Amino acid sequence: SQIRQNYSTEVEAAVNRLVNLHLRASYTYLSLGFFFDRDDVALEGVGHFFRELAEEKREGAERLLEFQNDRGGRALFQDVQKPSQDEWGKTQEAMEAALAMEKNLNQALLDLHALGSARADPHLCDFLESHYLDKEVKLIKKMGNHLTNLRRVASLGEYLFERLTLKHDGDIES
């Protein structure tokens, strides 16, 4: 690693378990994503929402892996834990189960900035800030808004929420 410079091994190991955090997160989003496409639920909108969330997480993890080899470090891959559940009931707990993941995923992330801000790594204070932290802050507010809307309609409102909110904006957001 002739390129390695100002990259502590105490932080190098953190992004590795952070990588796998994003991997596990996308893994549970994918499972959440397909549970809602099942016939027993038949909510196309929420399924697409969570599968797109898994896309985002899987692209984030692959970004921490190129940030790694960019910063000279060598990364390893612990196994990816199965999702924290197997059937997610209705959408209202599923979003809270999901919002619980982001706050955790945003929590484990702020630690990495706090870690590097202590070890005085500015490139990390730029890369996290730029890519990850703003996206995480914007993502919690999205699931927060969706939860506030779900509680309002709460299962007729559970049906209308998918059509009038998740499917509409989901088609026009991306």
Query: CB of residue 129 vs Fe ion: minimum separation in angstroms?
Result: 5
CA dist., res. 155 & res. 134, Å (int): 34
Q: Is 125 one of the binding residues for Fe ion (CB under 5 A)?
A: yes
Burial class (CB in 10 A: 0-12, 13-18, 19+), 32: buried
Cα dihedral: 46, 51, 53, 59 (round 10): -170
Residue 36 beta carbon to its own copies: minimum distance, rounded to whole angstroms: 9
59 labelled as ligand-binding?
A: no
Minimal distance, residue 123 CB to its own copies, in Å: 5
Task: Give the number of other CB atoms < 10 A from CB of residue 9.
Answer: 9
- Contact positions with Fe ion (CB under 5 A) in 83-112: none
**CA 160 vs CA 151, 153, 173: distances in Å:** 13, 8, 18
- Binding segment (CB under 5 A) for Fe ion, from list 60-68, 120-128, 131-139, 155-163: 120-128
Q: Phi-psi bin for 81: left (phi > 0), alpha (psi -120 to 50), beta?
A: beta
**Nearest distance, CB of residue 49 and its own copies, angstroms:** 15
Residue 130: CB minimum distance to its own copies, A? 7
The angle formed by the CA atoms of residues 104, 98 and 53, to the nearest 5 degrees, is 100
Q: Which two tokens stand for residue 111?
A: 């630690």
- Residue among 10, 126, 134, 171 that touches Fe ion (CB under 5 A): 126
Residue nearest to Fe ion (CB): 125
171 exposure class (CB count in 10 Å sphere: 0-12, 13-18, 19+) = exposed
Residue ranges in 129-158 that form contacts with Fe ion under rule CB under 5 A: 129
- Tell me the window of 32-40, 60-68, 128-136, 142-150 that interacts with Fe ion (CB under 5 A): 128-136
User: Binding segment for Fe ion among 49-57, 81-89, 117-125, 131-139 (CB under 5 A)?
Assistant: 117-125
Annotated binding-site positions for Fe cation: 102
Annotated binding-site positions: 102
Q: Using CB under 5 A as the criterion, which residues of the chain lie in contact with Fe ion when the complex forms?
A: 125-126, 129
